Each structure stands twice: as C-alpha cells, then as structure tokens.
Design a protein around this ligand. Structure first.
Ligand SMILES: *[C@@H]1O[C@H](CO)[C@@H](O)[C@H](O)[C@H]1NC(C)=O
Lengths: 52, 441
C-alpha cells in the first residue's frame, strides 16, 4: 500500500436558484460526479463528465 | 432530579431544555450529539481477490506415455497430450516422432496482491447503536462520553446519569450481506462459500487472507501445446474480482439515505438522521440553587425587532423586565416555533435584554421562559433571499408554519362564507316548516 497523487478537477462554478443547485463543470479528465439527497429517499446520481 | 424528554436524532444541533424543580431556580440543560453510530453485528464469510494460475514444469516423456493423477489443489487441471515432438535450444527434445507424451498441469492460487487488494464478504445482523453525547448544564462546562443508545445502560457524564433511549426507528443502511473493499462498503448479495461461479465476484474464495484452504472456480482448461514447443497453454475466465471492480457501481458510502457516513473499524453507519431519541438525565442536587437566592422577574414585555425565517438565527427580540435580587437568569423557549440562541442573560433591578432565535414561521408566536416566568413574543418575519446555504436548519417546520395572516383570512372567509350560506338554507328550511305548521293550526 502506498500514497499516490491523484488529480483535482477545477472547482465548479455554482449558481443558485429556488430549490435548485446549478453546477458548471469544466473537467480536464473524465471526472466522476455523484449526488444524493439527505432525506429518507436519497435519490443518487452517478455520472462521468468528460467535457464541459 | 430526573428529567425525561425526546430529542431529535440530529448531529450538531443541540437539544435545549430547562430542568424545573419547584423551590429551586431552573437548571438549563443542553444535550448535543457529537456522532451517532449504528454498529451492526458482522460475520466474515470469506475473502475474494484476483487469482493467480500456477503452472508447474510439464512432464515430457519421450518414447512413452504418462497418466494424470488428481491432486488437492484449487481448480486443479491435468491433461496428457500425446504425439508431441518438442524442440529446445539444443534441437529436438525427443527421439520418437509420434510416441512422445507431454503432461500439463495447472491450478489456481491467491495472487500476491491478495494481501493488500481483496474484498471481504460479510453477513450483517442487527447489532448495537452508540453515540457520543456532549452535555452541559447549569454552570457546569461541557462534558462528553460514549453511550449505548438502548434506553437501559446509564452513562455518568459530569456527575449526571444519562440514559439515551432506543431510536424510534430501527433503520439500518446495511442489507443482510455486504462487501467491504478498501474504504467502500457495498450491499452486494455474494454467493455462499463454495458456490462461486467463474467470472463472477465469488469465483475465488478463502475464509481468511492467510487460510490454507482456498476455493477456486474458473474455466481453467489446458490447451494442446503448439507444435514443437515446450510450454503449458491454457484458457481461463477473466477474474470476477477484477470484473466486479469495474461493475461495482455506487458504494453504500455514496447512496445511503439520511446522510449516513460509512466507517469500517468497526463497520458502522454514522450520523444517520433517522427518527428521534428518548432521553433521561438525572441531575444531582448540587446543581439546583434555591429561588430565594436567585433573581425573579415580573411585568415582562417581549418585542420582536427583526426576523427572517432563514435557517440561521435570523430572529431578534427584546424583553423588558422588572426583577428582584438581580443576577444571571436562564432563557428557554418551550415550543418548537423558535430556537433560542442564548442560554442565560444578566438581569439588573430593571431594564431589558435581547435574544436571538431561529424560526420557520411567517408569524412566530412563542413562549419564552425567564426564571420561572413566561412572556409571549409575537411578530412577523420576512423570507430569506439566499436560495441555497451550506448549513442545516436550526428550526423545525410544521403544517401551519407557512400560513400567513392573509391566507388565514381567506380560509376563514371561505369556510365562514360557505358555512353561513348552508346555515342560511337550513334556517330558511326550519322557518318555512314552522310557518306551514301554523297554517294548519
Ligand atoms: C462539546 O462542546 C464544546 C463547545 O465549545 C466543544 O469545545 C467540545 O469539543 C465538545 N466536545 C466534543 C467531544 O466534541
């Protein structure tokens, strides 16, 4: 077991609307985005983002 | 003096209350959960990892033949290939052209990576629930300890005996069978030991990472050597552990409801905001000061000067008061309409004090307790303008929290109007019958 240096994607631009989170994602490499709500029904999201 | 209550199963948001003992000044109590840990009972079923195929030197019998013998090796294969005429660097190995025989052997063993790169298959059963509770009361500073959330085991925190009741919901994010890989936990229904299939997660199985008894199920088939070449070719199904790594999907770490965090030492789900927790704390007599030695207040008047029903402490109010034996005084709001930021205030013989609160109500109306006295605070609150925040709400919602006075007016007009119209019809119905009765008589 060893420590490896992994990339960090550019920080997202975050825009706020009523009950809506808007992320503008500009990755350098295929970057995984996941989300989940914190309620009793955590609707998960999983997608790899390769382009803006 | 025992105080019993129910607090929400929330981390970082304290439970605040006054412990009221007639004849003694109320002792302000604050119980905050540092973390909540759902620790199921787990039993390691087996360990799976990428396999390695061991291929011993083949037996090449020149001008003759050999026979395969079964051996106690995982997924052991043995086949005898007749009619071989292999060549080495020194030329033809055998003299006979077609009477030579090669015996190939192969078997499966754990790879070197299995010592660091393996998945653990666990069977999960209902276990225990623990939490770390941060408690302060009266003039006693914050104290903390690990407690058992079962409602039976008392915890002594700063001379107070704390019994934290069982969770109102026996919910757990773990299914009956889970797979732990690295820092990740998966709700994967793995095959039982000895029943793994080739190319799937459990093709290779071992009870422990150092066990000498290994189960392997791959379609390991010995192939005939290429003409004139001494080697042991074979075909085999690609490892199902490496296949699973690609098809793992989202881990339980990323999909658990209620915002649970998954830790591995021991395997547990942390900070799941599920239901509520009954509580009972016995505070010693040393914490209670007689009323005759503490300030009391009267002629209270509460003014709400600013209010936004934001998640933060957007409410501000001022309380005018008259008192006797001026001194420090605890502050509390018994209702759920507003959460008070302050715990106590300093009173003078006369004057006023301010406090901050968080409420979801458009028109908050709540009781504020001040040294056994009470005052009602009323006012209007504006909505926040920030759509998204990075902190949780301090207050609690209700059915009627969002109903404004204007909405209530329309509801009252609607319900009153329709009811009055029906009543008018019923009164008219009753009177006409009475009039007709008098016609007869
Ligand atoms: C209890 O709360 C106080 C608040 O100031 C904090 O300093 C302390 O670290 C908390 N205890 C734990 C165990 O987090």
């Amino acid at each position: 077991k060893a420590k490896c240096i992994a990339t960090l994607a550019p920080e997202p631009l975050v825009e706020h609307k009523h009950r809506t989170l808007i992320l503008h994602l500009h990755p350098d490499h295929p970057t995984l985005l996941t989300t989940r709500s914190l309620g009793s029904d955590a609707n998960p999201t999983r997608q790899w983002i390769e382009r803006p | 003096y025992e105080h019993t209550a129910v607090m929400p199963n929330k981390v970082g948001i304290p439970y605040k209350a006054l412990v009221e003992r007639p004849g003694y000044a109320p002792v302000h109590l604050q119980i905050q959960l540092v973390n909540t840990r759902i620790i199921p009972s787990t039993n390691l079923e087996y360990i799976t990892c990428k396999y390695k195929t061991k291929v011993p030197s083949p037996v090449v019998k020149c001008c003759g033949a050999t026979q395969c013998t079964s051996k106690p090796h995982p997924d052991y294969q043995c086949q005898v290939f007749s009619g071989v005429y292999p060549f080495m660097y020194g030329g033809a190995y055998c003299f006979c052209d077609t009477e030579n025989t090669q015996m190939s052997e192969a078997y499966v063993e754990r790879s070197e990576e299995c010592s660091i790169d393996h998945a653990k298959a666990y069977k999960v059963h209902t276990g225990t629930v623990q939490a770390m509770v941060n408690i302060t009361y009266g003039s006693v500073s914050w104290r903390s300890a690990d407690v058992y959330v079962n409602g039976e085991t008392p915890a002594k925190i700063g001379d107070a005996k704390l019994i934290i009741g069982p969770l109102s919901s026996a919910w757990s994010p773990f299914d009956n069978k889970v797979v732990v890989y690295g820092h990740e936990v998966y709700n994967y229904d793995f095959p039982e030991y000895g029943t793994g299939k080739a190319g799937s997660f459990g093709d290779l199985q071992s009870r422990t990472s150092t066990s000498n008894d290994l189960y392997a199920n791959t379609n390991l088939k010995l192939q005939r050597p290429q003409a004139g070449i001494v080697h042991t070719p074979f075909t085999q199904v690609p490892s199902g552990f490496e296949r699973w790594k690609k098809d793992k999907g989202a881990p339980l770490n990323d999909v658990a409801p209620f915002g649970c965090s998954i830790a591995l030492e021991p395997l547990r789900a942390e900070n799941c905001a599920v239901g509520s927790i009954p509580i009972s704390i016995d505070i010693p007599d040393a914490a209670f000061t007689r009323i005759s030695e503490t300030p009391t207040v009267s002629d209270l008047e509460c003014k709400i000067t600013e209010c936004t029903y934001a998640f933060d402490f957007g409410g501000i109010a001022t309380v005018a008061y008259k008192s006797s034996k001026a001194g420090n005084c605890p502050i509390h709001s018994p209702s759920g309409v507003a959460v008070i930021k302050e715990n106590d205030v300093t009173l003078a013989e006369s004057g006023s004090f301010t406090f901050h609160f968080s409420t979801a109500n458009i028109h908050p109306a709540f009781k504020l307790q001040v040294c056994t006295s009470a005052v009602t605070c009323k006012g209007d609150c504006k909505p926040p303008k920030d759509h998204i925040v990075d902190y949780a709400a301090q207050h609690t919602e209700s059915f009627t929290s969002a109903i404004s006075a204007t909405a209530w007016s329309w509801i009252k007009v609607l319900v009153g109007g329709t009811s009055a119209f029906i009543v008018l019809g019923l009164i008219a119905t009753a009177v006409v019958a009475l009039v007709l009765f008098f016609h007869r008589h």
